Scaffold this active site. Sequence first.
Site, mmCIF file in Angstrom:
data_model
loop_
_atom_site.group_PDB
_atom_site.id
_atom_site.type_symbol
_atom_site.label_atom_id
_atom_site.label_comp_id
_atom_site.label_asym_id
_atom_site.label_seq_id
_atom_site.Cartn_x
_atom_site.Cartn_y
_atom_site.Cartn_z
ATOM 1 N N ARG A 158 0.796 -5.696 0.893
ATOM 2 C CA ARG A 158 1.114 -4.892 -0.114
ATOM 3 C C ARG A 158 1.277 -3.380 0.355
ATOM 4 N NH1 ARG A 158 -1.540 -2.932 -5.747
ATOM 5 N NH2 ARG A 158 0.477 -2.957 -6.820
ATOM 6 N N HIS B 80 4.449 -0.970 -0.255
ATOM 7 C CA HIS B 80 4.386 0.317 -0.922
ATOM 8 C C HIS B 80 4.837 1.330 0.066
ATOM 9 C CE1 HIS B 80 2.155 -0.588 -4.919
ATOM 10 N NE2 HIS B 80 2.955 -1.418 -4.659
ATOM 11 N N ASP B 81 4.514 1.290 1.395
ATOM 12 C CA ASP B 81 4.897 2.398 2.362
ATOM 13 C C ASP B 81 6.355 2.361 2.253
ATOM 14 O OD1 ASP B 81 4.863 4.069 4.421
ATOM 15 O OD2 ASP B 81 4.747 2.870 6.026
ATOM 16 N N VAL C 199 8.730 4.147 -0.537
ATOM 17 C CA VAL C 199 8.518 5.640 -0.662
ATOM 18 C C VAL C 199 8.986 6.318 0.553
ATOM 19 C CG1 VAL C 199 7.242 7.651 -1.535
ATOM 20 C CG2 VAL C 199 6.877 5.095 -2.169
ATOM 21 N N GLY D 92 10.791 5.401 2.995
ATOM 22 C CA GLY D 92 10.787 4.429 4.089
ATOM 23 C C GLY D 92 9.316 4.126 4.605
ATOM 24 N N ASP E 61 6.994 4.958 6.831
ATOM 25 C CA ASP E 61 6.724 5.991 7.554
ATOM 26 C C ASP E 61 5.293 6.414 7.523
ATOM 27 O OD1 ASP E 61 6.502 6.990 4.973
ATOM 28 O OD2 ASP E 61 7.775 8.603 5.235
ATOM 29 N N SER F 102 3.578 7.306 5.170
ATOM 30 C CA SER F 102 3.281 8.367 4.286
ATOM 31 C C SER F 102 2.108 7.908 3.081
ATOM 32 C CB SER F 102 4.694 8.710 3.515
ATOM 33 O OG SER F 102 5.090 7.586 2.506
ATOM 34 N N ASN G 35 -0.348 2.864 -7.175
ATOM 35 C CA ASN G 35 -1.572 2.539 -6.109
ATOM 36 C C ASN G 35 -2.904 2.795 -6.679
ATOM 37 O OD1 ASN G 35 0.185 2.117 -3.612
ATOM 38 N ND2 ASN G 35 0.890 4.326 -3.834
ATOM 39 N N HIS H 110 3.738 -12.471 -3.688
ATOM 40 C CA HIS H 110 2.908 -12.798 -4.814
ATOM 41 C C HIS H 110 2.187 -14.515 -4.636
ATOM 42 C CE1 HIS H 110 4.430 -9.307 -7.473
ATOM 43 N NE2 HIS H 110 3.609 -8.904 -6.269
ATOM 44 N N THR I 16 -2.131 -22.136 -4.652
ATOM 45 C CA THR I 16 -2.740 -21.833 -3.543
ATOM 46 C C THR I 16 -2.996 -20.171 -3.461
ATOM 47 O OG1 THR I 16 -0.563 -21.878 -2.372
ATOM 48 C CG2 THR I 16 -1.866 -23.827 -2.356
ATOM 49 N N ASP J 294 2.803 -19.514 1.031
ATOM 50 C CA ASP J 294 3.500 -20.782 1.070
ATOM 51 C C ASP J 294 4.693 -20.508 0.038
ATOM 52 O OD1 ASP J 294 2.039 -21.073 -0.991
ATOM 53 O OD2 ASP J 294 0.707 -22.618 -0.263
HETATM 54 C C1 HEM Z 1 9.280 -7.156 -7.266
HETATM 55 C C2 HEM Z 1 8.500 -6.004 -7.708
HETATM 56 C C3 HEM Z 1 6.878 -6.028 -7.801
HETATM 57 C C4 HEM Z 1 6.145 -5.751 -8.757
HETATM 58 C C5 HEM Z 1 6.526 -5.050 -10.113
HETATM 59 C C6 HEM Z 1 4.783 -5.859 -8.149
HETATM 60 C C7 HEM Z 1 3.672 -5.710 -8.899
HETATM 61 C C8 HEM Z 1 2.315 -5.930 -8.608
HETATM 62 C C9 HEM Z 1 1.166 -5.698 -9.105
HETATM 63 C C10 HEM Z 1 0.915 -5.320 -10.742
HETATM 64 C C11 HEM Z 1 0.183 -5.929 -8.634
HETATM 65 C C12 HEM Z 1 -1.469 -5.988 -8.983
HETATM 66 C C13 HEM Z 1 -2.186 -4.887 -8.594
HETATM 67 C C14 HEM Z 1 -3.506 -4.691 -9.215
HETATM 68 O O1 HEM Z 1 -3.814 -5.665 -10.154
HETATM 69 O O2 HEM Z 1 -4.331 -4.078 -8.638
HETATM 70 C C15 HEM Z 1 0.735 -6.452 -7.057
HETATM 71 C C16 HEM Z 1 -0.070 -6.916 -6.207
HETATM 72 C C17 HEM Z 1 0.557 -7.534 -4.803
HETATM 73 N N1 HEM Z 1 1.680 -7.583 -4.724
HETATM 74 FE FE1 HEM Z 1 3.226 -6.885 -5.884
HETATM 75 N N2 HEM Z 1 4.933 -6.186 -6.838
HETATM 76 C C18 HEM Z 1 6.164 -6.367 -6.620
HETATM 77 C C19 HEM Z 1 6.585 -6.776 -5.232
HETATM 78 C C20 HEM Z 1 5.858 -7.140 -3.975
HETATM 79 C C21 HEM Z 1 6.396 -7.194 -2.709
HETATM 80 C C22 HEM Z 1 7.940 -6.831 -2.439
HETATM 81 C C23 HEM Z 1 5.293 -7.517 -2.074
HETATM 82 C C24 HEM Z 1 5.297 -7.662 -0.488
HETATM 83 C C25 HEM Z 1 6.324 -8.324 0.279
HETATM 84 C C26 HEM Z 1 4.132 -7.611 -2.802
HETATM 85 C C27 HEM Z 1 2.854 -8.002 -2.517
HETATM 86 C C28 HEM Z 1 1.816 -7.905 -3.196
HETATM 87 C C29 HEM Z 1 0.569 -8.359 -2.784
HETATM 88 C C30 HEM Z 1 0.337 -9.359 -1.738
HETATM 89 C C31 HEM Z 1 -0.218 -8.075 -3.938
HETATM 90 C C32 HEM Z 1 -1.972 -8.431 -3.712
HETATM 91 C C33 HEM Z 1 -2.789 -7.337 -3.353
HETATM 92 C C34 HEM Z 1 -4.262 -7.489 -3.273
HETATM 93 O O3 HEM Z 1 -4.698 -8.476 -3.878
HETATM 94 O O4 HEM Z 1 -4.671 -6.563 -2.885
HETATM 95 N N3 HEM Z 1 4.547 -7.194 -4.110
HETATM 96 N N4 HEM Z 1 2.274 -6.456 -6.952
HETATM 97 CA CA LIG Z 2 6.636 5.547 2.954
HETATM 98 CA CA LIG Z 3 0.199 -19.576 -2.219
#
Ligand code: HEM
Ligand SMILES: [Ca+2]
Ligand SMILES: [Ca+2]
Length: 306
Positions: A38, A42-43, A46, A48, A50, A52, A70, A170, A225, A230
């Site tokens: 994640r 997020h890097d 914003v 790119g 980088d 940041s 964040n 996710h 899971t 997966d």
């Molecule tokens: C499509 C739009 C997306 C939205 C709106 C979004 C939103 C969120 C939100 C609300 C959380 C929960 C944060 C928290 O409760 O503290 C989260 C967690 C996460 N997101 Fe997304 N996300 C998106 C795309 C992505 C992408 C593109 C990736 C990576 C390829 C990603 C990977 C993750 C991961 C792995 C977590 C878990 C982080 C942790 O458990 O520490 N997300 N996301």
């Molecule tokens: Ca960045």
């Molecule tokens: Ca899974």
Amino acid sequence: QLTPTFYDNSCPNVSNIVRDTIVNELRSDPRIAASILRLHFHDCFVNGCDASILLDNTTSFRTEKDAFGNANSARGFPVIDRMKAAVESACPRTVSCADLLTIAAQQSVTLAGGPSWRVPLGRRDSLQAFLDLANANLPAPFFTLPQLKDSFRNVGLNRSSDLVALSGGHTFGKNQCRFIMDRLYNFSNTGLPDPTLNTTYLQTLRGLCPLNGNLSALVDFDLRTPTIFDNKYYVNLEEQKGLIQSDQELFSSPNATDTIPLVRSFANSTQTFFNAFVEAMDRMGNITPLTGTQGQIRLNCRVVNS
Ligand code: HEM
Ligand SMILES: [Ca+2]
Ligand SMILES: [Ca+2]
């Protein structure tokens, strides 16, 4: 042009050092793999990829760590500091924080059971952080499908496959109750739960996130899971079991004519999903990078070199 062989001469052991760090951390924190992936996301969204996002506050610019997407959410920064120090010891002033985080994301996915591949490298580190840009560019769980598409297109990812494949992130990790309270009790000011949320799962989620309860309580993104990378994430969507609004919209939005077939294809085949994920990940990792002599090779990821 970014290339996977960038450090094959200057720091051939970089990937291995990153992997070892994550393996060690996973023992005490099984959530770190998800957290690191994640951070890379997020890097990249914003200015790119980088690094940041790794910068801390200064009197001239605010840290992206205080962005709505964040704050009290992004995590794993100390772990990145650890691998950076280890890499600096093995190869002084060679690997940028931007590249380090990209490798960390890839290694995290593989360690969690996902695909294995060599990420393009050669990125350099930013000279500043972008809080306002982070608040504007990071998508939110309450975004509609059109808004999600807009958010990805805004940073350079035009393809619906980019959105559907990367959302597969996710397939593991945690989410706070705060982000689904509306879906559970009052969606879009209707006073009713989100109709696209499976009613049986609705009951389960309400038990984990009672009204007026602890909004910071954590729930698993993937009920099948929780910690394994997966394609189960997509099977959930097909059953209306995506956790957040932005997840389920990929399959249920009135604007999902183009994303539904992708969701199904990824749910039907692990290979199809994994291939698409690598493709999308490398595309996201190619968003406006600083290269050549642009930016720096940050020694401490938290601060610009002086
Ligand atoms: C499509 C739009 C997306 C939205 C709106 C979004 C939103 C969120 C939100 C609300 C959380 C929960 C944060 C928290 O409760 O503290 C989260 C967690 C996460 N997101 Fe997304 N996300 C998106 C795309 C992505 C992408 C593109 C990736 C990576 C390829 C990603 C990977 C993750 C991961 C792995 C977590 C878990 C982080 C942790 O458990 O520490 N997300 N996301
Ligand atoms: Ca960045
Ligand atoms: Ca899974």
